[PDB]
Symmetry: C5
Subunit: 311 residues, 5 copies
């Protein structure tokens, strides 16, 4: 089939629309997610026009291999979409009404800075390539863009499925292309972190600090060193889903902070003993008494330093 | 082919039916499972009608590309169903009897609150989209809905495969749609938990409490700290199949409880030593003697507090 | 095409046959395995009959879409079989000789009781559905049922590929169905367990018992507690392929047994110290001397109690 | 299409050829690997013959569904090969020149005895099934068998892609079959093992032996027991890709050996203490002094015992 | 269809072009990555030529099965490319303009020497096979080779998508083949390594060295041995994506170095005690005092020895 000819010199307006049936499987690592949805496209292919008087029909149905349809595709997809044609109904004037049930893995990037409170905007990029005879421009039919009430993305809170109304029109490989931006807004469900990560990962750090209430280097080595294992152990129980960072995570900084508060504790206890062994248990007692407040205070302040910086 | 015309103004009644051949692979994480089953649909497509006198035949067989069949689909499926047409037999009046052997990964959500005693209702959503000329409504042919005696879901106990008789009829993208709810009821096989999780994960917590029967801070640090590793170690051997929770698990609360009974034990032993070092081994002896009953009693009561709350 | 008409009122006999080309990938967890094999079916479709005198041919070859073939399927398969038609040759009388190279993931359940010495019978269920005009019954052509000499299932010992000669004939969804049972017998290759699981997992349990040859509570806490970590650590190195058990494994009981022999050892050492601290190092010395024999003897006997019960 | 008729009574000679484009993904566990290659087959199908004088053409090209091609398949493949037809060119006499770009996962078994120095011969089994009218025998066209210079199997060293010239001709399911053996020879790249497995896994075993340079049972329990954890810990960092063994690995024996040298060390230290506690620090001092040489010597000799046995 | 005949004796020039739509999933292990891109090919197939005067058309569109297209393929691909034809437009002279949207997993090897600062050149090998009548040579249409501004490879920094202008022309299996080299240049995003690997993996190594500030063999065994576990533990938290090395990694050397600085520390502490036990606490005090500087200095120098060697 041939592309529709111009009424005057204008490009073809293809009125897009995506309705999310089911949205799932967000791999924080790969920065992907799978989407199951309806794609409704509208265009005036004048050629198709039929009179209601002569044709006994109302709105004639058509097959995809039976009529011309523009090459509508996605940009940030793994493999091409799992398209399944629903209906192609042509209005008496020649206005086609395309519908399909696509199922493809999207590839939208994520922000792991603000994590575990991280908030995201996922992208779906609709593209259509212009031909040798006429050109194509995309439009957002505001009425066939949305999300079902049944859509669940366990771990995230689906806020609003929107669309960037203005299209991008550009040249590439000697052809005009129309690029649309579909934006999905999500926020994180961080409820479990506090009681099952931050609160237990804190307790471990405090069992470490019971070394300043001791005099015994033999009990403090077993305190500070053991809790370090306890940390890495729990740090392993909590192995999440977080890729390679050329930047810093809000957690990334906190983790680097703990790996110091254990090491610093090791210095303190190594000195607490060496000062006492050299027979000056006056500093060696002022130093232990100091870190009783120094560590907790420095820590609480260091958390505010991070929080104020990141957020 | 064209949809059947109305005898008067009524929509087409498609009499559904699902018989579970094989049910397997329940991923607690993704909240999915794979199903292998038979789909039997019945409708009066008057057009097909043939006389028994003129036609030498009884009940004529037909091909899927040879006759009109309504677009029957599933809502909560990963990728579209692996449909394999069995038989399409038309009764003399024009009553079609469709049958297929679909094989698709369902996406039904789960309740991890009551876990490891968690009980579930899984969902299969049958949908059919209405056309430009007539509309479609779904019905439950109570006689072709069930499960085979051979169906196994190791880890769960398959109770009853049912169907929500009343259909949902609603508008979406300017089209009428009929939505049916197929419900599968399952309960958990928690037998191994008690002797291979709760009972060993308890023993570790008790080897911790043998610190109140000691006077030695050097043996109690090695008791309480070591068992914490022993816990996280076993807690790692027991790494299950449990996604992200914006709520609380019955186990989730218990785990948070243990991470306290170890930390609290650390406080006790840090004080038991500090009281004795400051030369008051009267409290330091009343405090150790107290926790001999305090910890076990507080613990047993704390378990009842949880159990009564969750269940 | 139409099903063959009856010579008198009899159902069609389809003479089955499965020859295992390659058998592999047994997932103990999912209770599955993949099979690559040949399916040879024989039936007298009288219609096809051709005279050797008039037809210049001997045994005419035919295409699958060129002739009627009964809907032969498998019951316990993940997704439908990866069928690849080999040859369809019709004998002068009309006796068809079907052959294909199917490749599908089977779903046969397993017995993890007797494990690591567990022995299995895997199932392949061949089904054929009867039509509106005649019915179908299955037969075992004893000559085209077997296994190649090259078949390997590393970890198991392929004993005998058999077939349940008698077919199951039953009603379901108003249709007669013929169900055949293909049984594959396998046994376990447990050679590595003894020297790389039971023997090292024993040694750890004995380094624990060197606590009765000590007087020092500080060395016994470090003995008994450390070895518990050593156990869970090795118990983690040995993380196998074993699903959810609503019953008990032979290993399951042994594991529960070890988690006691460590806990019991903890009681002993907690008492050994508390008796000595209360100044009665007469029992505290009789109790330590007792467990020198009590633990080993109780243990060896407890293993016989299990072995005699399970086997 | 029909198989070519005999010039006299001979079977058809199909001249095979495999050229490895890309070879990758060797799963030591499943004993598989994926191969991307070219399959060139040559046969004299007399029927196709065309005169150079009458036909304006030279060597006529043909489609796969346009001409007869023998059912060429693989035996040890997961699912059937991902065949992609390249060219089918027929020489004036009727000599067909088939070519395709197959991509399938092979299933060749491995030897884990000599590991990490293990050497392998992988198998590709080409099969062709004979028909009702003529029979088929396979030949190795020595000129279209090889491997590209770009082929990489990181972890192995690709030595030589060969072919077993002599074919296997046998009866199965009343049909003649021709079986060819394609052999790929590979050897292991064990460079990292010595400095990042054997050398660190040795150091751990030596930190254990610093127990004979001590008198203190409290420091030796903490030495020998701790290093056992250190071992299992590192033994876990080194968790490779090695299936179930009904035999013994060269490493399998070494591992069983270390799990003794730790246990034996536990006996020594338990006696070193018990002899000294019973007041005979003359043996208890001869025994400690003995194991200073006994363990290292016994060990070095035990390694030679293994190496000489395995290799 | 037939290949275009020569204007004189020249081979056909196919003007290639690859524009990277989306580039993702780089598996350091398998040495692969997935690419989604546009392939534009240009050739003068004189046969297609049509006059602008007689033909009412301008630049006639054509189907792939409607015209001859050369067998353009990739060499280092897993399975054949997921090709999706965009447009085939023929200019009045007969100059075809092919375009497709391929999606295949590439197989380019990597350098893990300079890692985590490793820099790579990935390969895409375009091949075209010559026929019985004319031959084919490849060309780089410099104008349709590039990468989009949206291309992201999280963990790497996409530098420049280039092409080796000069083609490789060689004989293989009696056929001429044209091989092109597409090179993608990437560099690593090593920001997180320093604060979340090297800095914490250093701290652990320093808590070890607080053994020279002690006199107590019982506290030094618990220091040096415990930190070794802490190391292997963290070394496990940091389990990356790094295959089998027949060479040495920059990290590979550093890791081997740490496994010595712990072992050497074990020797020191075993001697520190044995010298003191033999009553010579003059060396035993000079040796401990020495390693206070010896270890740090030797270490810092050993890092420069590596860095200068690798880089």
């Amino acid at each position: 089939v041939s592309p529709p000819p111009p009424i005057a010199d204008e490009p073809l307006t293809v009125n897009t629309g995506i309705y999310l049936i089911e949205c799932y499987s967000l791999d924080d690592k790969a920065e992907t997610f799978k989407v199951n949805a309806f794609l409704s496209l509208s265009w005036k292919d004048r050629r198709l026009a039929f009179d209601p008087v002569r044709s006994g029909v109302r709105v004639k149905t058509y097959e995809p291999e039976a009529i011309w349809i523009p090459e509508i595709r996605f940009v940030n997809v793994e493999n091409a979409r799992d398209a399944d044609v629903v209906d192609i109904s042509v209005s008496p004037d020649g206005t086609v009404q395309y519908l399909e049930r696509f199922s493809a893995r999207v590839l939208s990037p994520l922000d792991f800075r603000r994590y575990p409170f991280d908030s995201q905007t996922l992208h779906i990029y609709l593209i259509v390539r212009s031909v040798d005879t006429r050109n194509i421009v995309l439009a957002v039919d505001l009425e066939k863009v949305g999300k079902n009430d049944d859509v669940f993305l366990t771990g995230w809170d689906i806020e609003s499925f929107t669309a960037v109304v203005k299209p991008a029109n550009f040249a590439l490989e000697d052809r005009l292309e129309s690029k649309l931006d579909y934006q999905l807004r999500i926020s994180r469900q961080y409820f479990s972190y506090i009681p099952n990560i931050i609160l237990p990962m804190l307790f471990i750090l405090f069992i470490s600090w019971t070394a300043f209430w001791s005099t015994s280097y033999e009990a403090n080595v077993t305190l500070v060193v053991s809790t370090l294992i306890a940390h890495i152990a729990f740090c392993i129980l909590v192995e999440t889903n977080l890729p390679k960072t050329p930047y810093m995570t809000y957690t990334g900084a906190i983790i680097f902070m703990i790996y110091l508060f254990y090491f610093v504790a090791v210095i303190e206890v190594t000195v607490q003993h060496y000062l006492k062994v050299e027979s000056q248990p006056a500093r060696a007692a002022s130093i232990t008494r100091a870190s009783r407040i120094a560590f907790p205070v420095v820590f609480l302040l260091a958390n505010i330093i991070l929080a104020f910086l990141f957020f």
